[PDB]
From Swiss-Prot:
Phenotype when changing residue 58 to H: In lung carcinoma
Positions bearing N-acetylthreonine: 1
Organism from which the protein derives: Homo sapiens
Gene: KRAS
Name the UniProt record assigns to this protein: GTPase KRas
GO biological process assignments: actin cytoskeleton organization; cardiac muscle cell proliferation; cytokine-mediated signaling pathway; epithelial tube branching involved in lung morphogenesis; female pregnancy; forebrain astrocyte development; gene expression; glial cell proliferation
Reactions that this protein is recorded to catalyse: GTP + H2O = GDP + phosphate + H(+)
Length: 166
């Protein structure tokens, strides 16, 4: 069993740091580099391979990019709790996913990262309300302390399994 997971969101939210915590178990990363990793995990008793695409690069839209994004089975929509503009951008990323997947119910999880920082600008309640409006889970994370990291990825695999049952 394999799951193709894609991590999206604004520059500097922690996409690479969350990916590296899951894959390499340490808190680290060249902001311009887009790369993929695999990890074998057991989630709710099921062994699976997670393929994680950590997105980066210039904002560009093309047939090849719409094709690389379309292969994602589930998406983490990551914002940083100290960056209001990254939270405001979440609607854009959710819309792009829905556009390339040609579907209204693509597996997604809303992730509020940098939960260890004291300089919060986005309240937990604003994020919970946004996730409820989308019908998706909201997970608070810190790539620095590892709070919520496995929960964000594993919850996205559970969202994919629920979608496969429909
Ligand atoms: C995600 C997607 C997507 C899906 F999910 C699903 C399907 C897709 C299909 C595609 O064809 C295409 C995409 C898709 N690719 C890329 C996107 C993107 N990138 C990509 C990443 C994320 C932000 C920035 C630019 N990125 C960076 O890596 C920025 C840095 C690290 C900055 C460096 C540069 C050197 O100097 C120091 C800083 C960089 O290397 O350029 N930015 C935006 O939007 C940004 C906002 C803010 C400004 C205006 N713009 C419109 C809204 F207002 C939001 N969207 C993107 C996008 F949709 C999708
Ligand atoms: N304190 C703290 N810093 C983080 C956390 N996640 C990422 N960072 C830092 O924020 C910056 C951007 O992180 P990065 O992973 O490159 O973001 P990306 O551009 O979304 O890939 C780096 O300096 C990271 O070390 C976190 O949860 N807490
Ligand atoms: Mg990165």
């Amino acid at each position: 069993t394999e799951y193709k997971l894609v991590v999206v969101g604004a520059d500097g939210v922690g996409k690479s740091a969350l990916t590296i915590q899951l894959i390499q178990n340490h808190f680290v990363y060249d902001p311009t580099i887009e790369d993929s990793y695999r990890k074998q995990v057991v989630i709710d008793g099921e062994t699976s391979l997670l393929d994680i695409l950590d997105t980066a690069g210039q904002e560009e839209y093309s047939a090849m990019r719409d094709q690389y994004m379309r292969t994602g089975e589930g998406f983490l929509l990551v914002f940083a709790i100290n960056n209001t503009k990254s939270f405001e951008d979440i609607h854009h990323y959710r819309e792009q996913i829905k556009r390339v997947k040609d579907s209204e119910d693509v597996p997604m999880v809303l992730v509020g990262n940098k939960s260890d920082l004291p300089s919060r600008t986005v309240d937990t309640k604003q994020a919970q309300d946004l996730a409820r409006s989308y019908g998706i889970p909201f997970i608070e994370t810190s790539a620095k302390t590892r709070q919520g990291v496995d929960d964000a990825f594993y919850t996205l695999v559970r969202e994919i399994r629920k979608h496969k049952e429909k």
